[PDB]
Amino acid sequence: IVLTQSPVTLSLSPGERATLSCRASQSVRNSLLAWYQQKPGQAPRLLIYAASSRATGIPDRFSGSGSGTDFTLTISRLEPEDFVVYYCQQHGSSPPWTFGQGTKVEF
Amino acid sequence: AYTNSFTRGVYYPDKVFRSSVLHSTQDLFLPFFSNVTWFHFDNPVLPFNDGVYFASTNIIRGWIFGTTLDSKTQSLLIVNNATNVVIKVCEFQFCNDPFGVYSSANNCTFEYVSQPFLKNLREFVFKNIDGYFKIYSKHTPINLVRDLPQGFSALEPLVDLPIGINITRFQTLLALHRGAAAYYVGYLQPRTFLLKYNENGTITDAVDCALDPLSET
Amino acid sequence: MQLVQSGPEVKKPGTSVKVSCKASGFTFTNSAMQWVRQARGQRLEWVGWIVVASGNANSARRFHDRVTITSDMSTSTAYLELSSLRSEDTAVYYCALNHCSNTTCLDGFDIWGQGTMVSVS
Amino acid sequence: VYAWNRKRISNCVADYSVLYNSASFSTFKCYGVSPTKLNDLCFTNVYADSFVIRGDEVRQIAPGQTGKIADYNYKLPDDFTGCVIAWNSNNLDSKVGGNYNYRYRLFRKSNLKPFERDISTEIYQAGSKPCNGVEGFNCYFPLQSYGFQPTNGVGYQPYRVVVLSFEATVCGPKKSTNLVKNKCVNFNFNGLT
């Protein structure tokens, strides 16, 4: 089971509406496709858990939606510190809780 | 039906020895000349209230004691199979009409096994006081089947069990194949008796102090 | 609620590494740590995961025979040692933990470590 | 210890001298009655709950004790009337190469009520999403087998633990002498003085 993510860079303006999607190649069991972000060279941190739920301590403006294979990360308000590589998860299967390629939220 | 209970139902009450002694006891006894219920093959439901004098003429094989059966209460069950009497306090499911009857053994708290003893008449007394269940017995040869014979015999104690269970109902079980049998049931009452211990130490005779004014005298 | 990880280890292509990851502020319940290896300039990867209470480790397929991922509940730690430390192993190693809210546990690896620059020189 | 064997003992004389004076039982102390004083006192029902645990959590088999075995495997009540016998069993239970027959319940939703025997080996759910009895993330089989080795230390050796519980057909014994005739004796027969 491998996970492919969608557009490899989001090169568009700050302060607007962007959509992030993880097109899985095999159907994710029990909808466990948590969403992480990782600013380059530092520790990642969790935003969406159980493929839709907002994490504790994390504020608003993010949204995980859908289940199964069709999937969406919904970011509402691109602040300059949200121009970060964003990552999938498949820690649902068994082995290879495969991540994604990431993307580049770019100005 | 009903039958006279001429002098029967008297038993050694306190496990001691007396010789040539008239002794008065205050204990759950079968009253003299009471009417006992005669059952002739079926096996109905009988209240236990205070204790049982049971008599019979190897058809019957055991007894079931308890209050609220179909497994909601631990039930006393006594079965004499094949020169072996077995006593269990397992919360058995009652059959609609038991007689395979001892099936569904669950939650067994007490178990006990002993050896039985074989125109004969089988007298038993079952009583339950202070959390203890007592079985008294004697096998007496006879030559009549109409009514209980007007002789005298005293029942030796045979079994004590420390159960402490609430009883108000009892059943008899008799082995079913498919010759009817008959038995007699009386109840015990707290009456005063005067007992006559012989030179051997056997109870030879007794009188009931509340029967008639002569016996009270 | 913090996973303090050990410092960097500059190593050699014949040696083996020993990466520890202590959990500060709390003790290990049935918490299911995972381990993430990031070669710099590449994506995050998956090494293996320990059910910390049970010790049932399970490593990834390319790491199937040469990493043992052990845990110790007495010290509230969870270790990692990777064998043979090839030139394609220079990375940053992240110990990610699932937070357990006693009554239950969460479904997300929220509290992470800080990294371990395992250098293959 | 998850499927701890309980046997009811009744209708017999319980001779405890061969237990206390055996000089082989390493851990032995008694709650609610002194061990040398319970020999001449009579109970109704005696349960001998027996299991095998690692030597560290012998202290977990105690009333008013919190831990892993005392919460998920075998809990004694606070009003525990009876006592615990634990002796080393490295020479029998710890076989060469590891003994994995003995397992203990490690993951459970709630702590056990006292004298509860849990036999279910369902795949424990630790998170929100149920995972229908298959193994995976937040899906743990709750029985983790002990690793028992002769190489292991004293605290890791297996200890066969037998727990006695008490509540009137369960008791000790006595005598003293011969019978004495034609002399003034102040006898004691069954209690009658």
Side-chain angles (χ1 to χ4, degrees), chain C residues 5-92:
Chain C
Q5 208 180 345
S6 81
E9 292 84 3
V10 189
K11 302 306 274 294
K12 193 69 69 181
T15 61
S16 175
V17 76
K18 186 75 178 28
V19 185
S20 170
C21 176
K22 188 268 183 181
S24 285
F26 63 101
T27 180
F28 275 123
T29 76
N30 53 7
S31 52
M33 185 180 288
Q34 84 162 356
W35 277 87
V36 165
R37 164 178 175 263
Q38 188 182 4
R40 195 255 313 271
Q42 277 49 59
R43 48 195 299 200
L44 301 168
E45 299 180 5
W46 197 68
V47 187
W49 72 303
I50 311 168
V51 193
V52 193
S54 85
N56 296 320
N58 208 316
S59 159
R61 204 61 31 71
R62 74 197 49 85
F63 292 163
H64 61 285
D65 59 357
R66 56 188 183 272
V67 60
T68 68
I69 313 98
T70 59
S71 72
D72 186 74
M73 308 263 296
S74 77
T75 61
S76 278
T77 43
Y79 292 163
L80 188 135
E81 62 77 21
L82 162 53
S83 160
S84 296
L85 270 186
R86 281 82 65 194
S87 48
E88 56 278 350
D89 291 331
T90 308
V92 165

Side-chain angles (χ1 to χ4, degrees), chain D residues 20-154:
Chain D
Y20 194 110
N21 315 330
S22 85
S24 74
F25 306 146
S26 314
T27 296
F28 187 24
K29 74 203 61 52
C30 296
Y31 309 130
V33 55
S34 164
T36 189
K37 188 268 183 181
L38 61 83
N39 209 323
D40 62 358
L41 188 153
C42 197
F43 299 105
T44 80
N45 304 320
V46 174
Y47 304 99
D49 315 327
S50 68
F51 38 83
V52 171
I53 62 170
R54 219 180 64 201
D56 295 319
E57 54 262 17
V58 189
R59 184 280 331 290
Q60 274 200 65
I61 308 300
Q65 187 68 41
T66 315
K68 182 63 69 177
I69 301 299
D71 286 340
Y72 297 153
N73 285 265
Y74 181 79
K75 179 158 177 66
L76 294 174
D78 291 331
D79 81 350
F80 174 60
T81 62
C83 60
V84 188
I85 295 93
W87 67 103
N88 198 300
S89 59
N90 198 50
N91 57 4
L92 319 171
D93 272 357
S94 67
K95 81 168 185 288
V96 190
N99 188 17
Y100 315 104
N101 308 145
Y102 298 106
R103 307 192 300 273
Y104 69 107
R105 182 163 300 273
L106 185 58
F107 316 100
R108 208 186 174 275
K109 317 162 150 64
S110 51
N111 300 8
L112 280 184
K113 64 203 61 53
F115 300 139
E116 208 282 335
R117 202 172 151 278
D118 208 347
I119 198 65
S120 66
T121 80
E122 61 86 20
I123 313 295
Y124 168 78
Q125 170 185 350
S128 309
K129 314 297 292 302
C131 56
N132 56 47
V134 303
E135 284 278 47
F137 169 72
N138 277 5
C139 312
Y140 315 124
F141 187 76
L143 309 183
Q144 196 255 334
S145 55
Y146 281 126
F148 281 148
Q149 192 71 41
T151 300
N152 294 354
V154 177

Side-chain angles (χ1 to χ4, degrees), chain D residues 170-173 176-191:
Chain D
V170 295
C171 13
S176 85
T177 48
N178 297 114
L179 73 164
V180 177
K181 298 197 234 163
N182 303 64
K183 294 187 286 185
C184 198
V185 297
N186 54 4
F187 47 85
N188 197 337
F189 278 29
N190 304 118

Side-chain angles (χ1 to χ4, degrees), chain A residues 38 42-43 91 99-101, chain C residues 38 43 61 94 106-107 109:
Chain A
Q38 190 268 330
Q42 293 82 17
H91 63 40
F99 282 50
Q101 295 297 109
Chain C
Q38 188 182 4
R43 48 195 299 200
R61 204 61 31 71
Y94 275 121
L106 185 63
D107 291 331
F109 293 139

Side-chain angles (χ1 to χ4, degrees), chain B residues 27-33 35-40 42 44-73 75-93 95-98 100 103-105 107-114 116-117 120-129 131-132:
Chain B
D27 175 82
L28 277 296
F29 279 103
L30 170 72
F32 281 162
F33 300 97
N35 281 317
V36 286
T37 313
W38 184 20
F39 286 114
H40 182 74
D42 306 80
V45 188
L46 294 172
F48 186 73
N49 297 313
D50 283 349
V52 173
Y53 165 77
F54 197 104
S56 282
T57 298
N58 201 357
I59 297 96
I60 47 160
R61 322 298 324 275
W63 278 271
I64 306 107
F65 312 118
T67 307
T68 70
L69 278 76
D70 297 341
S71 302
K72 291 184 299 303
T73 309
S75 77
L76 296 199
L77 179 136
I78 297 89
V79 173
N80 189 57
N81 184 17
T83 74
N84 204 27
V85 62
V86 64
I87 310 184
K88 295 180 140 174
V89 177
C90 307
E91 41 173 21
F92 286 110
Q93 61 84 29
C95 297
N96 291 3
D97 189 279
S103 309
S104 304
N107 267 2
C108 302
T109 59
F110 181 89
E111 199 265 351
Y112 174 46
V113 161
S114 282
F117 184 58
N120 47 6
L121 192 163
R122 304 181 161 52
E123 270 178 348
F124 295 85
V125 160
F126 317 112
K127 54 192 301 273
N128 199 55
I129 196 68
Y132 284 78

